Design a protein around this ligand. Structure first.
Ligand code: HEM
Length: 399
């Protein structure tokens, strides 16, 4: 049994193991950091099965749950939020914050998403690059998702810049464990104050909705509200930042497609669809433990055994996506859903918001800066460590 997680084949590539497994051993056992074994599912059909099977559980207190790191095992001891719940607890809590994320709500949020992106681009423009390249991540990829989620949660405008930086410290590879935890606790402390404030004078934000609709009636307590808000903040922010950076690098990598997008920003939606399939920046989030024996392919997964379903591998499944390793914004899509945002009841609560943010970014970025260029050889791009989810740490650009 090979050690898992696997390392990316290269900066922008998925682990080399997946293609081989899909072809010769689609359901196999891997060895986790603690020596425990877990089942790795690599084919699209099987990943979808794992994502929806009622015989599987997301509860982390079940022995056999596939924790991939030492820190992961420790976090599993805290009270859980809906991300780690099974029905009926799952939807009971998730439905408390879903309203803001519905397709309809996101459609109505479009003008706000657009102005947020416009303002950040204008700021990046006036900041210019006369004295050299600027870091697209720091100046744009990071603040876009950050300002939007913080604003939705209820953070006032003047606190956005500082809070965006602190949340980034949580996941920056450079941060020491102390700095990372300090930033973590600080954000939690801050949200605690927001909850107290909104309980007294509710405003138009997620935190206020939680306070008025759930805390006051006694459905959840103040700390629960803080944790739910915290989950919404940290769940996908870093992923969003990476997706934006990865999108820019990919366009640089394939000049012809950037030409097409520039000539027709209306292609943004399809470019984003291909991007979320090709670059599956969240690939270790579909995990379960079998509540009872379950057969998957030619294997029997016994009760209490763990399962990791790779949506990254599923997104490269040649049986579903023709020429899977080819990035093609004009790809002819099959009826099967690409899995960048997961599948089933737990499917990313912010999928529509995330896609709206990316679509807005890629339908505007090159309109603002038609000559935007990565200021370093693409082969020199600073990607996230190979033993982590795909992403980009910094991206120098000129325009
Ligand atoms: C492009 C960026 C994003 C990607 C690629 C992404 C991907 C995912 C994936 C793979 C999952 C697992 C779904 C499953 O269990 O099947 C997920 C869950 C989740 N995501 Fe995202 N996400 C993104 C952005 C966001 C944002 C912006 C937020 C917060 C506003 C967010 C909040 C969540 C939450 C709370 C969950 C847990 C949902 C549940 O278990 O019910 N995501 N996301």
């Amino acid at each position: 049994a090979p050690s898992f997680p696997f390392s990316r084949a290269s900066g922008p590539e998925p682990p080399a193991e997946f293609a081989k497994l899909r072809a010769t051993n689609p359901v196999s056992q891997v060895k986790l950091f603690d020596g425990s074994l877990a089942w790795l599912v690599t084919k699209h059909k099987d990943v979808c099965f794992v994502a929806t099977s009622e015989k599987l559980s997301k509860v982390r207190t079940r022995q056999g749950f596939p924790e991939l790191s030492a820190s992961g095992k420790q976090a599993a001891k805290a009270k859980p939020t809906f991300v780690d719940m099974d029905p009926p607890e799952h939807m009971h809590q998730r439905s408390m914050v879903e309203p803001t994320f519905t397709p309809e709500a996101v459609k109505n949020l479009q003008p706000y998403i657009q102005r947020t992106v416009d303002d950040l681009l204008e700021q990046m423009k006036q900041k210019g690059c006369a004295n050299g390249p600027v870091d697209l991540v720091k100046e744009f990829a990071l603040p876009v998702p950050s300002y939007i989620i913080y604003t939705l949660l209820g953070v006032p405008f003047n606190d956005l810049e500082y809070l965006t930086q602190q949340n980034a410290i949580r996941t920056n590879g450079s941060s020491t464990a102390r700095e990372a935890s300090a930033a973590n606790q600080e954000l939690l402390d801050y949200l605690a104050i927001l909850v107290e404030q909104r309980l007294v004078e509710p405003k138009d934000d997620i935190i206020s909705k939680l306070c008025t609709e759930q805390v006051k009636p006694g459905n959840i307590d103040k700390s629960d509200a803080v944790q739910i808000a915290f989950l919404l903040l940290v769940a996908g922010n870093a992923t969003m930042v990476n997706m934006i950076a990865l999108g820019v690098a990919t366009l640089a990598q394939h000049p012809d497609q950037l030409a097409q997008l520039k000539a027709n920003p209306s292609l943004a939606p399809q470019f984003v669809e291909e991007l979320c399939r090709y670059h599956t920046a969240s690939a270790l989030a579909i995990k379960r433990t079998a509540k009872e024996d379950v057969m998957i392919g030619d294997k029997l997964v016994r009760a209490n055994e763990g399962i990791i379903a790779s949506n990254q591998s599923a997104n490269r499944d040649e049986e579903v996506f023709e020429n899977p390793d080819e990035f093609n914004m004009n790809r002819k899509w099959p009826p099967q859903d690409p899995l960048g945002f997961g599948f089933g009841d737990h499917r990313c609560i912010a999928e529509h918001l995330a896609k709206a943010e990316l679509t807005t970014v890629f339908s505007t970025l090159y309109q603002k800066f038609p000559d935007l260029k990565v200021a370093v050889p693409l082969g020199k791009i600073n990607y996230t460590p190979l033993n982590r989810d795909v992403g980009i740490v910094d991206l120098p650009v000129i325009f």
